[PDB]
Ligand binder design. Sequence first.
Ligand SMILES: Cc1cc2nc3c(=O)[nH]c(=O)nc-3n(C[C@H](O)[C@H](O)[C@H](O)COP(=O)(O)OP(=O)(O)OC[C@H]3O[C@@H](n4cnc5c(N)ncnc54)[C@H](O)[C@@H]3O)c2cc1C
Ligand SMILES: Cc1cc2nc3c(=O)[nH]c(=O)nc-3n(C[C@H](O)[C@H](O)[C@H](O)COP(=O)(O)OP(=O)(O)OC[C@H]3O[C@@H](n4cnc5c(N)ncnc54)[C@H](O)[C@@H]3O)c2cc1C
Ligand SMILES: Cc1cc2nc3c(=O)[nH]c(=O)nc-3n(C[C@H](O)[C@H](O)[C@H](O)COP(=O)(O)OP(=O)(O)OC[C@H]3O[C@@H](n4cnc5c(N)ncnc54)[C@H](O)[C@@H]3O)c2cc1C
Ligand SMILES: Cc1cc2nc3c(=O)[nH]c(=O)nc-3n(C[C@H](O)[C@H](O)[C@H](O)COP(=O)(O)OP(=O)(O)OC[C@H]3O[C@@H](n4cnc5c(N)ncnc54)[C@H](O)[C@@H]3O)c2cc1C
Lengths: 315, 313
Amino acid sequence: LDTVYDAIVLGGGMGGLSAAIYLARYGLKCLVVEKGRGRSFWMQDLRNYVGLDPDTPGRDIITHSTQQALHWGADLLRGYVEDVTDEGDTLAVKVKVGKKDSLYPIFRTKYVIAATGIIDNLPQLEDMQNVYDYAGYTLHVCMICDGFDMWDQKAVLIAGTEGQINAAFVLNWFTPYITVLTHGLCTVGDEMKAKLADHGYPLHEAAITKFLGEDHKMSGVELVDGTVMEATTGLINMGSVYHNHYLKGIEGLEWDGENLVTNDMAQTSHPRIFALGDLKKGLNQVSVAVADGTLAATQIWRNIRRASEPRKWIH
Amino acid sequence: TVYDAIVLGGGMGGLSAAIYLARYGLKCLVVEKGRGRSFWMQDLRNYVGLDPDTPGRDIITHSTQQALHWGADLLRGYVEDVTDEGDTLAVKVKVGKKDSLYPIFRTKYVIAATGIIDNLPQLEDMQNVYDYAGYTLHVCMICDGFDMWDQKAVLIAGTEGQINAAFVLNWFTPYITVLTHGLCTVGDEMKAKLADHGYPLHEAAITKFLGEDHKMSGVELVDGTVMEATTGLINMGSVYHNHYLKGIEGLEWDGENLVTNDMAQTSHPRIFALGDLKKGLNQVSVAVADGTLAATQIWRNIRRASEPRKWIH
Ligand SMILES: Cc1cc2nc3c(=O)[nH]c(=O)nc-3n(C[C@H](O)[C@H](O)[C@H](O)COP(=O)(O)OP(=O)(O)OC[C@H]3O[C@@H](n4cnc5c(N)ncnc54)[C@H](O)[C@@H]3O)c2cc1C
Ligand SMILES: Cc1cc2nc3c(=O)[nH]c(=O)nc-3n(C[C@H](O)[C@H](O)[C@H](O)COP(=O)(O)OP(=O)(O)OC[C@H]3O[C@@H](n4cnc5c(N)ncnc54)[C@H](O)[C@@H]3O)c2cc1C
Ligand SMILES: Cc1cc2nc3c(=O)[nH]c(=O)nc-3n(C[C@H](O)[C@H](O)[C@H](O)COP(=O)(O)OP(=O)(O)OC[C@H]3O[C@@H](n4cnc5c(N)ncnc54)[C@H](O)[C@@H]3O)c2cc1C
Ligand SMILES: Cc1cc2nc3c(=O)[nH]c(=O)nc-3n(C[C@H](O)[C@H](O)[C@H](O)COP(=O)(O)OP(=O)(O)OC[C@H]3O[C@@H](n4cnc5c(N)ncnc54)[C@H](O)[C@@H]3O)c2cc1C
């Protein structure tokens, strides 16, 4: 009944587990809520993170850091965050527990760390397994992450909107051999079609029917209109769904598009809510998310420490 | 002939920057002197993905190999000076310890990632300190506070500002004894505050750390004082490895730290600063992320000034 957590970490991914590790090692009472199978879970090769081999899967990191978090004293709840509500001095966090016959317990806490990230939109094919066979292997979702591994390859840019097609003029740094596929989504305007033609990047607007290859290595793409092309890699640039629905009930949050605006310690405009990694305005990388968790946990500790009574040595 | 970026220091922040720079297709040089602060870290306690007993030296070997794998160049040397040539910077490196040469490299950008090194109490034989420093004698409260919880500890602090750490360390344990190691006499006001909190104060120089297998058991002072303690925190300041910036104009400082923006960029346009050199928390995670942001800003600068790569048909 009375039990109030010092902080509840929403999402047990890269940024969340870092925050959880620090929170527990600051002697604070914290809870991690993880639904499972998040974005980092679909990462097959973490390419650019100090200390880890460049073929480490995200799932192995999640397993490692979850055990570490528990080892230091964090609590873990496997469930789905539904809503966060403001009770003034504390926040209330409702969690869906159980996929079938679910229970919706409510937890109270001094602080919330929003670390639930995003999930990339994928092209909808008749059988999504054809996409999963390559997505995260040779079909990439993050240019910073895998650009080097695409160098001078024949690539496809899968982009739904005119703003998403503009990535071709950054991706060309890594390879000029870009073919744009709209997957039959928004029609391309004349001004953009002329720019692509001026750069030499072919454009195909027919819906994609199948990705060709074997052993997770792309070899080509086929469209509904019979078009067939050769390509050994690609970039998905179709936007993302943001895992921030539980914040509907919170007032006073400041946004930059779909991203939360945070200060240097990853604090939102709401004094008791922090936001990490892919949810916040800034670069979307593992290293950046882990550091956000470090700073958020440290700011929370500083708040709680400075409001507590000094621990004196009684003689 | 001209590097896209030169990374000064091949530690936590520098090797991250080098990894990203190389994977951005940029020509970058890492200058590493060897045996830095992270080299003396025995257990990285709080870093996502790594076991909490991982030594810093093992990380350096791993990430240096990765940096080289992606195409970064490595020079084993000592950065001596950085000069501003306008469109580029010149970086002089001492190569060779006994018979040295001073080659000069030019670059569009410099990443200052040479960190700091903690001051240690000077004993007759420094090995007595090294036996415990980084094991049970800590230099970073955030790093090892949890591992000190409710233990009898010593705070080794030279100045009144350094003694003030006792009023943050008390969060982890109230059983703090302050040792000034005979460096600065403590004022009456601070003596009264320590007494009110119950933290004993000893001002005599330390002679020996007691214990076995890197596990502290006590401390002995020159005046014969002996005490029991299983851990401690060194708070005697640090030497900053930023001497090579003496000639540069337009840099902003906060104390000994360089002031940087969100992409770890210093007030000078072509100089970035990472990790322990910059104002902010001193952690591995923070340093690694700084290297990510610096490398990404440099790439954006160079990319946006380059000509688009077109597909010729
Ligand atoms: C590069 C990449 C590769 C991918 N590869 C694959 C793949 O190979 N196979 C695959 O399946 N997917 C893959 N995905 C993910 C896929 O695209 C979909 O996003 C995913 O299948 C959605 O899962 P879901 O429908 O369960 O949605 P979720 O949002 O995970 O769940 C939907 C609902 O389930 C309930 N729920 C979820 N978790 C819990 C819980 N712990 N407790 C209680 N209730 C819960 C909630 O009501 C929730 O709203 C990949 C994604 C990417 C970006
Ligand atoms: C294929 C692929 C490869 C990549 N490669 C790299 C790389 O090489 N280098 C790099 O820096 N970055 C890479 N990234 C991106 C990187 O994974 C993200 O930037 C990083 O994971 C962000 O961390 P985060 O903690 O913000 O989000 P995540 O790590 O995704 O963590 C969020 C967690 O929250 C959980 N969650 C979501 N909603 C709810 C809810 N309602 N309730 C409870 N839990 C919830 C999710 O299941 C997930 O586990 C890659 C991404 C992909 C898809
Ligand atoms: C917690 C902790 C534990 C420690 N434990 C130990 C220990 O167990 N053993 C130990 O020895 N030290 C240890 N140290 C480090 C110690 O305190 C001193 O900082 C160290 O001995 C200084 O080395 P140095 O005199 O070579 O100084 P440096 O600054 O490393 O070198 C001094 C000079 O050498 C030249 N030089 C250095 N490197 C190069 C190069 N690659 N090429 C050309 N010239 C170069 C330059 O002119 C430079 O100015 C520890 C430090 C800490 C914080
Ligand atoms: C004993 C100990 C335990 C620690 N434990 C933790 C922990 O558990 N968690 C945590 O987050 N942090 C810990 N830290 C702190 C952590 O090591 C630093 O925050 C981190 O190393 C900062 O990275 P950096 O790249 O800024 O500095 P460094 O990692 O020190 O990198 C700087 C590099 O520059 C080189 N260099 C210096 N001067 C020159 C020059 N003139 N020319 C060429 N090269 C030069 C150095 O040799 C070094 O390799 C610990 C520190 C110590 C001493």
